[PDB]
Design a protein around this ligand. Structure first.
Ligand SMILES: *[C@@H]1O[C@H](CO)[C@@H](O[C@@H]2O[C@H](CO)[C@@H](O[C@@H]3O[C@H](CO[C@H]4O[C@H](CO)[C@@H](O)[C@H](O[C@H]5O[C@H](CO)[C@@H](O)[C@H](O)[C@@H]5O)[C@@H]4O)[C@@H](O)[C@H](O[C@H]4O[C@H](CO)[C@@H](O)[C@H](O)[C@@H]4O)[C@@H]3O)[C@H](O)[C@H]2NC(C)=O)[C@H](O)[C@H]1NC(C)=O
Ligand code: 5GP
Ligand code: NAG
Ligand code: NAG
Ligand code: CA
Ligand code: ZN
Ligand code: ZN
Length: 706
């Protein structure tokens, strides 16, 4: 009886043949295996379905941005964001090197492209042999290291021969046998491109790929290793149906110009022709402004590289062009109709939160639970997972180590909460009392737990000076070094102008006075905690609850609290809110040091002001609608990092439909709670009852669009 014909068998303890001390780990990749394939065509894929039912499976695996083969395949084995491991796209360019990159190029085998540290390099440093077959980065030697058994990419090699090749390696002597293995197939990406996600060729391809995995499992069984191997069946990205009618050509707004180069696709980037002479000299800002809101319902959007949604993490690399393009689903962009390969073929590269860009993940073996279905997770988390399976100390990566502990029978690493590095001090009443020049028209522990019911946010900043200011409706963490609130937490239940009051607990700043703010300048002040809380709550008008805010952003911020927040409190039976300013001028995704902070403090209206690049907001509710935010059994988080812009060009306010464009901006800039943590240097939910591993799972979550 073949492996697919046998029923499920619990592999609680690894049953290994002699010469084996611990089960090896194979990473099997199927390029272009969209997550929707297995959801719908499970009955046509008997082998893969058994792996799903007897292993650890996830409905959707979120890939990196852009959704291309090389960046993702390399992000899997490095656990790094594409902006950090160097491989931004299949075709890209580095200005500092004056060299282009391609899969079919001599530049591909250049070690100067590949940053970070892949798993086979990690295994090599810790005396673990590794045998790869066609994995991106396996052909090239990184840090002077090559896998003990490798094969230079040759797409002509038949699939059946690839499986047998790995099977031959598994039989090597105990001293010369690799412990980590890789496998790569071009299907169903190839069939996906040429005929579309919904075709007879993909069904024929899926069945071909399904039987091929079945060949491997029967082969493992004949070697007596079917219950002694850890298999991770993964993919790089999904597949979306492109259309000729749904394609964007830049020439229509610019003309048949030759001063600019466009890397076509759903994640288009633009660089000047005179390169690297004008790579930086070229002002991209003008081109972006000249390209925004040209169509009534534009299916693309010009983005300066730091102005992209932070959830994408697609800015801090030399190879990423300073001008990028975000497109609606099923749409691609190019300069001229001649550059593109074809328009009505299956494509990929769209937003990694899109439904059809989602990838596959099935963990099977003695180390994985049987028939366990877990929530969605990013592919950068897999790197740490493999380190635990190979007993390796992971290189510094972007994955939350331990967040995938729920997948394993016996978890190897037990994570802990980050220690508080902030110098926490106290602010009593010391400075009374300046005149603010404002016109106004006519025990403690019990009130604490109501505002921070999951525990106060911990200050991960080193070594920032932070004060805790307690109020009757909210608790706010105030910064003494920046003289503005870092965060403000309050609980908003289901149903419950030019004036300000000086907070005598904080030192007076010239920007606290209403006299500082004129009605002509676009810069004004906003509240972290809404004043319309619970007559009117007056402590929200405290000086320590205001932050410098553009007037254009006030359009989004007020509607966020006056309309959406109240609606969300009814739908989710109340919400706990933590809000604050974001300062990331070097657009690296992490909080800025005091040094770079002093460099970006502009001066406006005769006063020095550090103005926020973004504003974060984390909404927490109960998973059980019967419970209020003060009595949650399980949490329900959703974070947002809203861009602080002087204008709403991104939104195309033109047409004046305010209730529409705002929510679309909110949904677009949703982010992981971890993302907020990384960018503010704060740690949430530390006093929450769930374990650390559970909390990591919660904080790294993002919803899939459509
Ligand atoms: C995802 O996960 C990855 C993995 O960690 C994260 O990527 C890391 O980001 C951090 C910060 O963003 C990186 O640290 C910085 O490294 C840079 C660059 O290093 C080189 O820079 C110069 C080259 O011109 C050179 O000066 C450096 O030379 C030496 O520097 C010091 C001197 O003492 C020495 O200790 C080093 O060994 C070097 O020999 C070097 O060649 C560097 O510029 C940064 O320095 C800043 O901070 C240091 C203190 O650390 C400070 O002294 C400086 O003033 C300066 O402010 C900093 O070291 C890290 O290298 C990245 N890791 C990799 C491999 O990419 C990424 O952040 C994560 N993403 C997200 C969004 O979380
Ligand atoms: N030259 C080269 N091509 C590769 C390699 N790996 C995959 N490819 C090819 O690149 C394609 C992936 O591109 P994509 O899926 O991003 O559109 C696949 O069709 C595959 O044949 C490699 O390591 N080297
Ligand atoms: C950059 O590359 C192009 C072609 O590779 C070459 O013609 C040009 O001279 C190079 N410029 C520099 C600065 O080396
Ligand atoms: C690629 O692999 C095929 C199948 O093994 C082989 O016949 C062919 O010679 C290889 N091509 C190259 C470029 O060596
Ligand atoms: Ca930063
Ligand atoms: Zn691919
Ligand atoms: Zn492809």
């Amino acid at each position: 009886k073949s492996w697919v014909e046998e029923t499920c068998e619990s592999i609680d303890t690894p049953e290994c043949p002699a010469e084996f001390e611990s089960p090896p780990t194979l990473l099997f990749s199927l390029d272009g295996f969209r997550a929707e394939y297995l959801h719908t065509w499970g009955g046509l894929l008997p082998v893969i379905s058994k792996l799903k039912n007897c292993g650890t499976y996830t409905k959707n695996m979120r890939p990196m941005y852009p959704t291309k083969t090389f960046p993702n395949h390399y992000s899997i084995v490095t656990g790094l964001y594409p902006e950090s491991h160097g491989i931004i796209d299949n075709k890209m360019y580095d200005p500092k090197m004056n060299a282009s990159f391609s899969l079919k190029s001599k530049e591909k085998f250049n070690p100067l492209w590949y940053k970070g540290q892949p798993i086979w390099v990690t295994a090599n440093h810790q005396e673990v042999k590794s045998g790869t077959y066609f994995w991106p980065g396996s052909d090239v030697e990184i840090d002077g290291i090559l896998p003990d058994i490798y094969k230079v990419y040759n797409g002509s090699v038949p699939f059946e021969e690839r499986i047998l090749a790995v099977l031959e390696w598994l039989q090597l002597p105990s001293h010369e046998r690799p412990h980590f293995y890789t496998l790569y197939l071009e299907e169903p990406d190839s069939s996906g491109h040429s005929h579309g996600p919904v075709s007879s060729e993909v069904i024929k391809a899926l069945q071909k790929v399904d039987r091929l995995v079945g060949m491997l499992m029967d082969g493992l069984k004949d070697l007596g290793l079917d219950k002694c191997l850890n298999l991770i069946l993964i993919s790089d990205h999904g597949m979306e149906q492109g259309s000729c009618k749904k394609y964007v050509y830049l020439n229509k707004y610019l003309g048949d110009v030759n001063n600019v180069k466009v890397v076509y696709g759903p994640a288009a980037r633009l660089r000047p022709t005179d390169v690297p002479e004008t790579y930086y000299s070229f002002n991209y800002e003008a081109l972006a402004k000249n390209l925004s809101c040209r169509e009534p319902n534009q299916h693309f959007r010009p983005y300066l590289k730091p102005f992209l949604p932070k959830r994408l993490h697609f800015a801090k690399s030399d190879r990423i062009e300073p001008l990028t393009f975000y497109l609606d689903p099923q749409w691609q962009l190019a300069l001229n109709p001649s550059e593109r390969k074809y328009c009505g073929s299956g494509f990929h590269g769209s937003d990694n939160l899109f439904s059809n860009m989602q990838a596959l993940f099935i963990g099977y073996g003695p180390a994985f639970k049987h028939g366990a279905e877990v929530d969605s997770f990013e592919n950068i988390e897999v790197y740490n997972l493999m380190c635990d399976l190979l007993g390796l100390i992971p290189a510094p990566n972007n994955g939350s180590h331990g967040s995938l502990n729920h997948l394993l029978k016996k978890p190897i690493y037990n994570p802990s909460h980050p220690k508080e590095e902030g110098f926490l001090s106290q602010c009593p009443i010391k400075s009374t009392s300046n005149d603010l020049g404002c016109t106004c028209d006519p025990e403690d522990d019990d009130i604490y737990h109501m505002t921070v019911p999951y525990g106060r946010p911990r200050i991960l900043l080193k070594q920032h000076r932070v004060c805790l200011l307690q109020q009757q409706q909210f608790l706010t963490g105030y910064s003494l070094d920046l003289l503005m609130p870092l965060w403000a937490s309050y609980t908003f239940l289901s149903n419950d102008s030019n004036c300000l009051y000086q907070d005598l607990r904080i030192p007076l700043s010239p920007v606290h006075k209403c006299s500082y703010y004129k009605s002509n300048s676009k810069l004004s002040y906003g509240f972290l905690t809404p004043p319309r809380l619970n007559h009117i709550y007056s402590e929200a008008l405290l000086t320590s609850n205001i932050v410098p805010m553009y007037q254009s952003f006030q359009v989004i911020w007020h509607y966020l609290h006056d309309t959406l927040l109240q609606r969300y409190a009814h739908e989710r039976n109340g919400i706990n809110v933590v809000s604050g300013p974001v300062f990331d001028f070097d657009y690296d995704g992490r909080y800025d040091s005091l040094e770079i902070l002093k460099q970006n403090s502009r001066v406006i209206r005769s006063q020095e002001i550090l103005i926020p690049t973004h504003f974060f907001i984390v909404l927490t509710s109960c998973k059980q609608l019967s419970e209020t935010p003060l009595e949650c059994s399980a949490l329900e988080s959703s974070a947002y990092i809203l861009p602080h812009r002087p204008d709403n060009i991104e939104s195309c306010t033109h047409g004046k439909r305010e209730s529409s464009w705002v929510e679309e901006l909110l949904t677009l800039h949703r982010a992981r709670v971890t993302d907020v943590e990384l960018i503010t240097g704060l740690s949430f939910y530390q006093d929450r009852q769930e374990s650390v591993s559970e909390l990591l799972r919660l904080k790294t979550h993002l919803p899939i669009f459509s």
